[PDB]
Design a protein around this ligand. Structure first.
Ligand SMILES: *Cc1c(COP(=O)(O)O)cnc(C)c1O
Ligand SMILES: *Cc1c(COP(=O)(O)O)cnc(C)c1O
Ligand code: NA
Ligand code: NA
Lengths: 251, 392, 392, 251
């Protein structure tokens, strides 16, 4: 498939930026999570970044650490996450779906088998949090063989060699954390999405104005879930309100 | 790109988020430079000798082997300042931190003694030390928390996630990802992402080097085998290193068998785990069928690491080193035996290594063999643990 | 009649019941013989080196003296096997016991670590060890009681009298009066009846001998003064001995001041006691106006001995050595200071000696002086004591 | 005075052995102790050995250790002991009185002053438990200057040189713990009293038959006190019964 390519082409024809929210699959529960995701989509999310709960997420911060806790407490497993992914794709045929994984869950039963499973359920990209470009060969190779876009993070402390590698290895979009944007475009890198501290409408407009193709809210969505655990209805209401505002800022 | 090979066969690597790669590359470079700098070596040797107490003794244990054809020696790391071998490499890493122009040390610990070790090295060398540890661990480790605070270290309780060791580690690395320019992450074992497995080995190899010289002086030949417990792998690789090219010398690593391998409650990932990717490395580990990392178990907290250093996994794969396991009860018996017959109270971790040497002797009492057990630490810290058990 | 002088000036002697004199004469003779026997010396040196960990390091403490003209070194007896200097002489006495054809060791202890020391030496050398201790002390010393029992020693609770240390000592000596042919009484300090003050000094003098060689190697000259705490006097005389004829070297002994000399609650009999006859010797002691022996007091149990070794009383009388006192609070501060600035946790006993060196430095920061403090032991055992105090 | 010399001469004219009981002054109290001592005398004790409570009696055994405890619990001091000694002598002019002391209580305020105090109250001998003949010079010299008999213990493990010293240094009587008796007589030692395990009439007759001039009950009396602490009247009754039997065995 070419969901990311089709999305960005459509956004470009509309001189629009992309707004991508992240959430942990199964947080706070399978059912409530499916509702959350449908709400994010209805509210205007252009794409989704979805995490699969892992026991030792050495990268993520407290908000995410607690998100996994809630998901595990609900008995969420990678197998159930893939069941959810299939359901989500059956309901939404064109929205790009990206996974945020930890190396062990991808490597566990065979790297190739993992990306084959992703292709089977309809996933579009996979960002493996603890696999730097230096260790990415078997991962990106398997991703490509299964029509999955391998996504890489372009850190603050990135140098020129890293920019070139990310431009060369990545597909779908470049996960960014003005010159960087110009250099990435110069090296024909996948469209860049700003993912650093995206929690307010003005940050979304700023990202697009800086040259990025959009913005990723890495934890603002999770915080809203964490805050409304007592009232699922109010949780969805606030999520719809936030996403709608963030997406409006991209137009 | 790196200066040294990050892998030992298929094991090892640098599986960390991209943001931490510069910190690792910087450290590898400083290490390579330091290893070629006579001044760094002289400074490191001075601290080991005049502060830590190296070289440590090599004690012959006649009472234990009486009536058999086994001759047993114990490498006395229990006499090292701090009571355990950990001191050797934390001093080395502290010096590397200073070489890089850093004045801060970051570490994390649970029930281990790595926090105390990191704190004492930081106090000696004028480094600001901050140690992360799960809130739950703080409440159960009052003694060590006090030791670290007495030594000027800032103990930071972590409440996020499950408030356990994994959360402390996460916080420590997150911290380091933003402060590596002024702070050094002190990893406590020969594991994790390159260059740590290599650095820790090199900063612990004096154990094996001294043992070689001491055994040649006393017996006029090399050991038939050197035996060491394996939690993360540092004391064992420290003993093994200088002997790797001596093909006639057996290298035996002892993982904790806990309540018994068949019970599932053990800490023997090298021989009973499954290869995975965790803590920045590809290595054998305790994990669920679907890839979640499981916890190891052992009467000895020090051997409670769900994985193992990559070089050990490699040495095993090619048959250069052999790994076995010893149960809680076997380690307890060895602990009692050393106390009663040699007047030495061994750490329960070290007791696993002694327990295996005792088995090698007892199973074939007429087999002539010269053995060296690495007594990685003293067991004063285990008196309560052992007392309560024997009690019940 | 004796082979050696039982007195140091008017101090010392053999004030024991007639029935114990043969035991003392026998011991003195064996000692004199052993001191001239190269084989005994070689055997003793082998144990000290390969079992106990001698020689111990001499650590320079730059961080502590920064900004002053004082240069401070610490003799690391805290790194000796067992954690304290006591190990040196118990090994020596155990060898003497074997020389006399004995296979049993008798000792007594209260809150001290002499029981553990006697037990470990007995386990190593195959001696049957029995340690007497007041019933009241048993109930409060569960940890050490367990250590001694782990090492095969028979711990005998004494219920007679006040069920305290003095009753244990009495029972031990009564025992010895009837069993000296097969058992040796292991006295734990440089006090008591001749020949013990002399034997203990000689079996602890390697402390001073090593210090002399180490300071000459590092500074090219002798210390302006060597400083050591004084409970009974063994670690101090061990440090002092080899320096006595070096007139330029000051010998400073530090008695515990407890809550303060003026409070009456201290353990400084040498400078604030009165000469008397007790525990087989004539020496300064804590006593009532009518001659009953009083108890000493100190935050540190190890310095809780109501009298002092006769040789110290003598060295003081002729002005060769100077004695001072340090209070509980002064010792606590030194303890904290060493932990924070050097990463070494000192025994509270040793902390008294460090506290005085700190005072010598701080009172006259521009005075050029090379000092050596005898760090008689490690303070892991004092963490709880210090923790609770700071708590309140 | 010459109380011991006069006693033994009288016992000899009667072909009789001496029976000497030991008790701690002030055990269990000053008043009860004075009564105990008067009872021992009335029952037939030929002489007395009296101990002064000391904080660290390294020699004595449990029975005596507990005797001192009781005495200290009653607030007994050396000063009060001397007050008792004066009272005892005022009531009994000829019975020899011996003290069993620990070196510090004798040395404390001056050795000479101590023996002068003994002479003043009417004591006849002093055995210093922790002063072997080798360290006895200043003690025996002070004793003699004040007409006090210095007494020494002749142990089981005694050799010939010790026998000669004890024979030469001692006065009053030799505290013994057949050949020894002959050698002591050979060296003109003070009359020997057997003090080892004297707790039954047959041991007293045996001692005299062996050549000794008598026997000393080192702890049998104290045991009787310890056993009847609840009934002072019964205590005195049993003490009178025991001493009477022990003394009869000496005739
Ligand atoms: C920390 C420790 C160990 C375990 O660590 P390795 O890295 O596996 O050596 C073993 N023994 C002692 C005494 C320890 O303190
Ligand atoms: C026993 C002890 C002492 C006191 O004994 P001395 O005989 O006075 O030396 C001092 N320091 C330490 C650490 C001790 O264990
Ligand atoms: Na492990
Ligand atoms: Na003292």
């Amino acid at each position: 498939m070419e969901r990311y390519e089709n999305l960005f082409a459509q956004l470009n024809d509309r001189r629009e930026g992309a707004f991508v929210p992240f959430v942990t699959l199964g947080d706070p529960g399978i059912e409530q999570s499916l509702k959350i995701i449908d709400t994010l989509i209805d509210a205007g999310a252009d794409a989704l970044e979805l995490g699969v709960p892992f026991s030792d997420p050495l990268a993520d911060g407290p908000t995410i650490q607690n998100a996994n806790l809630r998901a595990f407490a609900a008995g969420v497993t990678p197998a159930q996450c893939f069941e959810m992914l299939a359901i989500i794709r059956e309901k939404h045929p064109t929205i790009p779906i990206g996974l945020l994984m930890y190396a062990n869950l991808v490597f566990n039963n065979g790297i190739d088998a993992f990306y084959a499973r992703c292709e089977q359920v309809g996933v579009d990209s996979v960002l493996v949090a603890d696999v730097p470009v230096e260790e990415s060969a078997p991962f990106r190779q398997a991703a490509l063989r299964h029509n999955i876009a391998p996504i890489f993070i372009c850190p603050p402390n990135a140098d020129d060699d890293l920019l070139r590698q990310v431009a060369s290895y990545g597909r779908g979009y470049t996960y960014l954390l003005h010159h960087l944007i110009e250099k990435l475009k110069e090296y024909h890198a996948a469209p860049a999405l700003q993912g650093f501290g995206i929690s307010s409408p003005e940050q979304v407009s700023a990202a697009v104005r800086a040259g990025a193709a959009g913005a990723i809210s890495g934890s603002a969505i999770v915080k809203i879930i964490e805050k409304n655990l007592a009232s699922p209805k109010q949780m969805l209401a606030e999520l719809r309100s936030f996403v709608s505002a963030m997406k409006a800022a991209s137009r | 790109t790196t200066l040294l090979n990050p892998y030992f066969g298929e094991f090892g690597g640098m599986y960390v988020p991209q943001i931490l790669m510069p910190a690792l590359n910087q450290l590898e470079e400083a290490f390579v430079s330091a290893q070629k700098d006579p001044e760094f070596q002289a400074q490191f040797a001075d601290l080991l000798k005049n502060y830590a107490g190296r070289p440590t003794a090599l004690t012959k244990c006649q009472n234990i082997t009486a009536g058999t054809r086994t001759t047993l020696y114990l490498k006395r790391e229990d006499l090292l300042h701090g009571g355990a071998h950990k001191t050797n490499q934390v001093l080395g890493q502290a010096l590397l931190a200073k070489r890089m122009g850093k004045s801060e040390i970051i570490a994390e610990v649970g029930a281990g003694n790595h926090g105390v070790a990191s704190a004492l090295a930081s106090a000696l060398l004028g480094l600001k030390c901050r140690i992360y540890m799960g809130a739950k661990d703080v409440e159960r480790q009052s003694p060590n928390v006090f030791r670290m605070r007495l030594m000027g270290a800032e103990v930071i309780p972590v409440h996020s996630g499950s408030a356990t060791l994994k959360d402390a580690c996460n916080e420590a690395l997150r911290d380091w990802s933003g402060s590596y320019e002024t702070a050094h992450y002190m990893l406590g074992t020969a594991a994790g992402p390159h260059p740590y497995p290599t650095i820790v080995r090199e900063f612990q190899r004096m154990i094996g080097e001294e043992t070689k010289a001491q055994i040649l002086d006393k017996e006029g030949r090399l050991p038939d085998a050197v035996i060491a417990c394996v939690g993360g792998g540092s004391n064992a690789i420290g003993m093994f290193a200088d002997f790797i090219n001596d093909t006639s010398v057996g290298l035996i690593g002892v993982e904790p068998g806990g309540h018994g391998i068949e019970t599932g409650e053990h800490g023997a990932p090298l021989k009973h785990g499954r290869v995975g990717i965790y803590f920045g490395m590809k290595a054998p580990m305790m994990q669920t069928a679907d890839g979640q990392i499981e916890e190891s178990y052992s009467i000895s907290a020090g051997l409670d690491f769900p994985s193992v250093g990559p070089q050990h996994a490699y040495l095993n794969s090619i048959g250069r080193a052999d790994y076995v396991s010893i149960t809680d009860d076997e380690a307890l018996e060895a602990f009692k035996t050393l106390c009663r017959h040699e007047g030495i109270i061994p750490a329960l971790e070290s007791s696993h290594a002694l327990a295996h040497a005792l088995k090698m002797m007892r199973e074939q009492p007429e087999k002539e063999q010269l053995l060296v057990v690495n007594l990685s630490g003293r067991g004063d810290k285990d008196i309560f643990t052992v007392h309560d058990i024997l009690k019940a």
